[PDB]
């Protein structure tokens, strides 16, 4: 039995042990193109 101050305190490394069979992906989602915003340029310098 050891004084608390000399006991380890690190939780089980579950995130280093699970080893999911396949690597994670980038969970891309989308609503698609802004169809009213297609071929519309608002960045015009007055000439």
């Amino acid at each position: 039995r050891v004084k608390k101050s000399a006991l380890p305190d690190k939780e089980f490394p579950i995130i280093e042990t699970e080893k999911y069979p396949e690597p994670p992906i980038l969970w891309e989602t989308t609503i698609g193109a802004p169809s009213r915003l297609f071929d519309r340029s608002d960045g015009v310098k007055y000439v």
Partner: protein, 60 residues
């Protein structure tokens, strides 16, 4: 969540009928093939494997 496996109940269950027994009996003997699963148990298990198709989909 984010589970990438199939889970469509069609993964490992040999859902044929007793016709599968006739099929496995169509690879070893003629009438009473029992000696083949009694002896060649490891061969009878290597004759039982599933199809495989993989699709990676890497990161960006």
């Amino acid at each position: 969540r984010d589970t990438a496996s199939i889970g469509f109940s069609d993964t490992h269950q040999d859902e044929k009928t007793l016709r599968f027994l006739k099929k496995q009996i169509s690879q070893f003997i003629k009438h009473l093939k029992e000696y083949y699963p009694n002896n060649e148990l490891t061969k009878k298990l290597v004759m039982k494997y599933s199809d495989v198709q993989l699709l990676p989909y890497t990161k960006g």
